[PDB]
PDB file of C-alpha atoms in Angstrom:
ATOM      1  CA  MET A1370       6.035  -5.538  23.900  1.00 37.37           C
ATOM      2  CA  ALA A1371       5.198  -3.187  21.052  1.00 41.16           C
ATOM      3  CA  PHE A1372       3.299   0.094  20.856  1.00 41.30           C
ATOM      4  CA  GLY A1373       2.309  -0.394  17.241  1.00 39.47           C
ATOM      5  CA  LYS A1374       5.869  -1.015  16.102  1.00 38.61           C
ATOM      6  CA  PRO A1375       9.163  -1.650  17.962  1.00 44.00           C
ATOM      7  CA  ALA A1376      10.883   1.735  17.731  1.00 43.65           C
ATOM      8  CA  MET A1377      11.694   3.370  14.391  1.00 45.55           C
ATOM      9  CA  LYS A1378      13.431   0.210  13.140  1.00 46.93           C
ATOM     10  CA  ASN A1379      16.620   1.431  14.861  1.00 43.54           C
ATOM     11  CA  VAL A1380      18.026   4.552  13.237  1.00 42.86           C
ATOM     12  CA  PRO A1381      21.785   4.073  12.505  1.00 42.15           C
ATOM     13  CA  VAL A1382      22.374   7.622  13.714  1.00 42.20           C
ATOM     14  CA  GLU A1383      21.421   8.528  17.264  1.00 39.36           C
ATOM     15  CA  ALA A1384      20.565  12.175  17.878  1.00 39.21           C
ATOM     16  CA  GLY A1385      22.633  13.523  20.740  1.00 41.56           C
ATOM     17  CA  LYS A1386      25.785  11.614  19.879  1.00 44.33           C
ATOM     18  CA  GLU A1387      28.817  12.542  17.795  1.00 41.37           C
ATOM     19  CA  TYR A1388      30.428  10.231  15.251  1.00 46.54           C
ATOM     20  CA  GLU A1389      33.537  10.460  13.091  1.00 47.95           C
ATOM     21  CA  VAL A1390      32.400  10.579   9.494  1.00 49.91           C
ATOM     22  CA  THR A1391      33.768  11.364   6.064  1.00 49.63           C
ATOM     23  CA  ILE A1392      32.451  14.075   3.762  1.00 51.40           C
ATOM     24  CA  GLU A1393      32.887  12.182   0.553  1.00 55.27           C
ATOM     25  CA  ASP A1394      29.971  14.118  -0.946  1.00 56.18           C
ATOM     26  CA  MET A1395      28.952  17.777  -1.154  1.00 56.58           C
ATOM     27  CA  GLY A1396      25.481  19.172  -1.731  1.00 58.08           C
ATOM     28  CA  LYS A1397      24.128  21.847  -4.072  1.00 56.48           C
ATOM     29  CA  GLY A1398      24.275  24.382  -1.271  1.00 57.85           C
ATOM     30  CA  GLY A1399      27.774  24.117   0.138  1.00 58.09           C
ATOM     31  CA  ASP A1400      26.512  21.456   2.519  1.00 58.18           C
ATOM     32  CA  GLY A1401      28.589  18.407   3.353  1.00 62.85           C
ATOM     33  CA  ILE A1402      27.145  14.931   3.019  1.00 61.18           C
ATOM     34  CA  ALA A1403      28.384  12.469   5.575  1.00 60.76           C
ATOM     35  CA  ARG A1404      27.312   8.879   5.199  1.00 58.80           C
ATOM     36  CA  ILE A1405      27.018   6.424   8.062  1.00 60.51           C
ATOM     37  CA  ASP A1406      26.555   2.908   6.681  1.00 59.76           C
ATOM     38  CA  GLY A1407      24.869   4.622   3.750  1.00 56.32           C
ATOM     39  CA  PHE A1408      22.648   6.828   5.888  1.00 57.75           C
ATOM     40  CA  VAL A1409      22.883  10.348   4.498  1.00 62.96           C
ATOM     41  CA  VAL A1410      23.873  12.760   7.247  1.00 61.72           C
ATOM     42  CA  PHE A1411      23.886  16.418   6.201  1.00 62.40           C
ATOM     43  CA  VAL A1412      26.599  18.551   7.762  1.00 62.17           C
ATOM     44  CA  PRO A1413      26.260  22.346   7.177  1.00 62.02           C
ATOM     45  CA  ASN A1414      29.828  23.051   8.259  1.00 61.51           C
ATOM     46  CA  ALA A1415      31.955  20.101   7.182  1.00 63.25           C
ATOM     47  CA  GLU A1416      34.660  20.136   4.515  1.00 62.76           C
ATOM     48  CA  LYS A1417      34.851  17.605   1.673  1.00 65.90           C
ATOM     49  CA  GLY A1418      37.316  14.751   2.049  1.00 66.34           C
ATOM     50  CA  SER A1419      37.783  15.434   5.746  1.00 66.59           C
ATOM     51  CA  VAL A1420      37.179  13.019   8.608  1.00 67.93           C
ATOM     52  CA  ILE A1421      34.994  15.079  10.894  1.00 70.67           C
ATOM     53  CA  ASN A1422      33.304  14.441  14.210  1.00 72.07           C
ATOM     54  CA  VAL A1423      29.645  15.308  13.758  1.00 72.81           C
ATOM     55  CA  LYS A1424      26.932  15.533  16.381  1.00 74.66           C
ATOM     56  CA  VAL A1425      23.683  14.244  14.923  1.00 75.21           C
ATOM     57  CA  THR A1426      21.207  16.852  16.122  1.00 74.08           C
ATOM     58  CA  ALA A1427      18.188  16.443  13.854  1.00 74.31           C
ATOM     59  CA  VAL A1428      17.172  13.078  12.452  1.00 74.16           C
ATOM     60  CA  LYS A1429      14.486  13.489   9.800  1.00 76.32           C
ATOM     61  CA  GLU A1430      12.329  11.078   7.785  1.00 77.62           C
ATOM     62  CA  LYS A1431      14.875   9.902   5.196  1.00 74.26           C
ATOM     63  CA  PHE A1432      18.060  11.574   6.435  1.00 72.81           C
ATOM     64  CA  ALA A1433      19.687  13.282   9.410  1.00 73.36           C
ATOM     65  CA  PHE A1434      21.387  16.582  10.135  1.00 76.51           C
ATOM     66  CA  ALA A1435      24.614  16.858  12.101  1.00 78.52           C
ATOM     67  CA  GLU A1436      27.106  19.524  13.147  1.00 78.49           C
ATOM     68  CA  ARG A1437      30.887  19.892  13.047  1.00 78.12           C
ATOM     69  CA  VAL A1438      32.148  19.374  16.600  1.00 77.61           C
ATOM     70  CA  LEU A1439      35.547  20.429  15.256  1.00 77.61           C
TER      71      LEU A1439
END
């Protein structure tokens, strides 16, 4: 059972769910970079070094965008 390919190879981050992540990295625009298993999850409203609960709202081609549910 495959419509071309089986899903998108399972994205580690599921849009519509919220995960506790760390903001070990910051971007060149005051954006916080969470990383789930290495998957870069951009968080526009997270603080660096904090463990924040982020709702992945927009998974893109090579990365996803989340939001601070805090």
